[PDB]
Design a protein around this ligand. Structure first.
Ligand SMILES: [Zn+2]
Ligand SMILES: [Zn+2]
Ligand SMILES: [Zn+2]
Ligand SMILES: [Zn+2]
Lengths: 359, 359, 359, 360
């Protein structure tokens, strides 16, 4: 029954998905005498928290009630009093919290704050789900780096194109539509300039109700990207580029005029660790990296990914010179190759989608 | 009811799986006045036929009864009256054959012999399930070529080793064992010399009572196979090598005196269709190809395979110069890449096993 | 998409489940620029409607937004502005109504108030689920008659006690426990006096979640009820008795003193249809009929029931003279017995619970 | 797991005899040598070879040093040919896997001892539950000297068999009627009171596609009220036994027996069910499908003579005091004396729900 309410809490949180920007999804339910008197979710960025909505709806009923929150109630004093304080003042006598704040400086602070007012606090109810709920945000807050998903499509023998660079019909429309879901769950989409030169993709989210568009991140060492590429001309989504000092100043000017934001790194080669750090500083908590065997090569090599999703088509492309899924340096001994764990196997249309994660 | 009995015949037939050597599995059910009176199956190589068991069991009831057979009764008047005849001298009024004999030469001789004696023969019953029953054997008879299965193990990104050649266990123990099952359902095992010198394998069917070791076939362009390797020596299983005219006469003679059957090809490179033709001449109905990125490439480019089985580990190897699954020429244009069809997906331990087939 | 939003409103609606008692369950979700900005449900009797909670949570985002509502917004003027008014006063652009207010008069009057304000009203979105959400309330408003549920317990052979009146162990504590639930989802509990004179029940919901005891209705033609019965003295809940002119005058007086409500029908025998009409006029929207095989017999003969619930135990009583499930007259010819339809057949403990509905 | 696999096969082979073995139990057997199946057999015909004989013959010399799986204990008695336990010993079989022992407590384990005496390893219990399921009725009769009894009836949701005027026209569906006909095939007899014979004058014959040797028709009488008019009498379609008593007209007793109709006479004015079943259990009958008469069903119930209850409920309410109920007659006066049963199955058929229950 404690789970029944916490589950309601989790379902409520889900209604805010993609309306909170970088803020976590949170659900709150106020139960008084066995009756649901208030429900809340965090629906808009920089706007009221779930507890604020749930408490207000509860009105006088908050007095003596219990409240279930999927994430520890904030405890810092900003423009308005913190939710833990809001709870204290409303008269709630018991609080059920799924999980603690991910920040080490904050964790337990709200909890203790409320206990210190008489309120009884039980923790852990449906933690796993509370976890999956804000998985990207959670990882971002705990490490300070965006959650990275690498994705690629290949033939059954591991090729992403023939020896002539032909990749027409390697993935079915069904697989492409299924992959399109990640363009909605990540804040940015990333590829190397090679993908732009070969495929000239828009890299946009074209799903049903596609409101916001993710930031398009291109890795372009020498700034050799075609000035007429969709990513530079369609204005559909923000476009950011990472180059080095070898980039041409006049070209940067022309592109900035197109609204492209350019980040010039101080190294001679682009370091994925550098770009991930700069994206986090910009508030990008997630990256859908979908292209360039070499780009995928660096992320793997550096160990900078949390999820790897490969789509395999029932086809065999020959190839000594056909390009494989992951290129670059790679690991030399089977003893140094990290072990992943298949997290999922799904058939989409005639293709098979395999998803795996580290450790 | 019609299909019911034939289904029983089929279930009986399967009980002979792996015990009949090169002979086909067959089931027979005698039904009299609406009651099952006889049942039979081919259980052992060179022994009684399904019809022979069923007729005996049914004894006196055999007269005026129906008989359901999964495969057209034998016709040759060899050193014992054939089953078609045995069905006849027994008083059986009606025969239900599921399919005709695969040998385009005899196909129908049985049906006719019987019909040309008063017997009512009706074919087609569950012919579909009967095709499944003897898949490999039927392909052999229908095409005159051995049924081929390609098998390989690889990382999730399609490498069969690191850029160092380190094959040091990509796939898990559990996956190798599942793979062993095939050395048991194929009359031969094939690999290029490359595999011989790198693993000096036994290529033996090291599972329970095999009661027969498969032929070990090796593709050796120049006959550079080491004369100390297990396949040459160890006298455990027959070992056939295919080579070209670059082979040394004395090496060819030497190894021949050790029981090694050497076949010489008058072409510059070994041509897969030729190797498959010669093997069918020698009576080999199926071959399990498991070694060589290049050998697998030849079978794929030539379209010479009936089944492909890939085991993917939860690992990423990387490196542009790491050997991929299928090497060699391969297809240059995606419009020429044949569409296959996933047939099965089974997780084996921490590894995934994908199996697929043509058209 | 409207589907999704209307579904959300339904799930939010359920959350009020048995907490609004008389009031129906309504869910409200306000959408602005493809984003959910408001969610509401009717949570307590006499309190804020669903639309109110939703609109308040939406705040300024309500302007030019859409809103989904499981039930036509009220137009009730007086103690507060009707929700139909709050909707336009908030600047809502379009409203989606799942179904209209079943109250004959009020039907369409809410849609109109809004339509004449410029609001584009669209209806019928998921009218199916929204129909089952308030099954009893709907029926009561559409027909003017309380929703009726008949409930009984019996042995597998259909007897309700032995031929000596013993019914000590018919159904299990679990069935009797599952039965209790219905004592809370109905505004009233109805029984003949036979039940009171036989068992002298309290007819109260014992379940630890009550805060509003249902009306205890006793059909007592000649007013023979034991004056000292719990139903008259315990005064834990309202007790309404239906009699006729054959009731002793002084006795009715002594009973009313205890605060019991006595209705004197004008017919010489109690007519179910009349009792139901009167119960409706008094506000009672639903009645749970537990006792009297004869009372059940009358409800069934008149066709005055929306649902039938029988608990069957794995026992056989037998007995020509043992009492059956349905007493009274009964139908003379099979051609005249109405056909019901099984709606649910779930096992409760060692017993089987069968539920059926008319036509 | 491999062992269970072979016993599974043995059980599936046994089912192929489901058709005609008459009173003989259904048995299966498979012989395996060095990991290969070499012999399969089942009891296919009443009076003919046992599953073991078939399997052992089929195995030939492979029997030597082999294993054999049998769903039932190999017979050990001496008749016209040697018993299977003997055949197994003589063929050189090394070990036997027996699902369950023989039913007849007078024969139970005798075969096991014989083989064990010859040094054959006997492992028991593999898939015993299923073997139990396989010959459940036979298994009951052998173990109780009594016929397996199934009671079946159809009624309204409120447990009525007809309205207060006797009309029972559209009581249960055609599907349920159809599903009810199946049982006339798994039972050797169909029991019904004279009340029924005169009521609808039924054939009580099995129509399901494929039926050999029709089931014995048993009528529970008293005053030999059965109208010579038709059906079970001058409808020579199968046996029609009749249990009667004293007040049985002397003239007609033979006037009927003149066809092929049997006529048992009991020394009581009350046809006592337990007596009837014992007679049947004597005449080789092993199962009875009682379907007619609420009083008839009541008799069996009070007496506690049933292993299965199958009631069909139609979504209808007939109501009415005086409307006939499912089970009539004596019955139990105290609830403490009502046997607790157990529901074993809830199947929906057409618009009707079919409930089956079994004792404790
Ligand atoms: Zn907060
Ligand atoms: Zn043959
Ligand atoms: Zn309202
Ligand atoms: Zn025997």
């Amino acid at each position: 029954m404690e789970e029944y309410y916490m589950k309601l809490a989790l379902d409520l949180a889900k209604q805010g998905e993609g309306q909170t920007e970088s803020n976590p999804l949170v659900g709150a339910v106020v139960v008084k005498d066995g009756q649901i008197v208030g429900m809340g979710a965090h629906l808009k960025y920089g706007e009221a928290h779930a507890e604020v909505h749930a408490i207000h709806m509860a009105g006088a009923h908050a007095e003596g009630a219990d409240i279930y929150v999927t994430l520890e109630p904030c405890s810092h004093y900003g423009k308005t009093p913190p939710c833990a304080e809001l709870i204290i003042n409303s008269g709630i006598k018991r609080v059920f919290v799924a999980m603690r704040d991910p920040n080490p400086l904050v964790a337990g602070r709200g909890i203790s704050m409320m206990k210190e007012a008489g309120i009884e606090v039980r923790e852990g109810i449906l933690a796993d789900q509370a976890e999956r709920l804000n998985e990207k945000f959670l990882h971002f807050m705990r490490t300070g780096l965006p959650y990275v998903t690498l994705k690629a499509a290949a033939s059954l023998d591991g090729k992403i194109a023939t020896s002539t660079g032909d990749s027409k019909w390697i993935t079915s429309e069904a697989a492409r539509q299924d992959a399109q879901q990640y363009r909605k769950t990540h804040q940015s989409i990333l590829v190397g300039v090679g993908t732009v030169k070969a495929d000239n993709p828009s890299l946009t989210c074209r799903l049903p109700n596609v409101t916001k568009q993710p930031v398009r991140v291109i890795l372009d060492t020498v700034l050799s990207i075609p000035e007429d590429a969709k990513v530079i001309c369609d204005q559909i989504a923000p476009t950011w580029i990472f180059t080095t000092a070898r980039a041409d100043e006049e070209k940067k000017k022309r592109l900035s005029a197109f609204g492209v934001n350019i980040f010039t790194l101080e190294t001679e080669r682009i370091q994925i660790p550098d770009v991930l750090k700069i994206l986090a500083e910009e508030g990008i908590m997630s990256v859908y990296v979908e292209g360039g065997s070499a780009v995928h090569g660096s992320f793997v090599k550096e160990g900078c990914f949390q999820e790897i999703i490969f789509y395999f088509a029932p086809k065999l492309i020959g190839g000594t010179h056909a390009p494989s899924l992951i290129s670059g340096e790679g690991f030399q001994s089977m003893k140094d190759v990290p072990l992943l764990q298949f997290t999922d196997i799904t058939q989409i249309g005639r293709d098979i989608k395999l998803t795996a994660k580290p450790t």
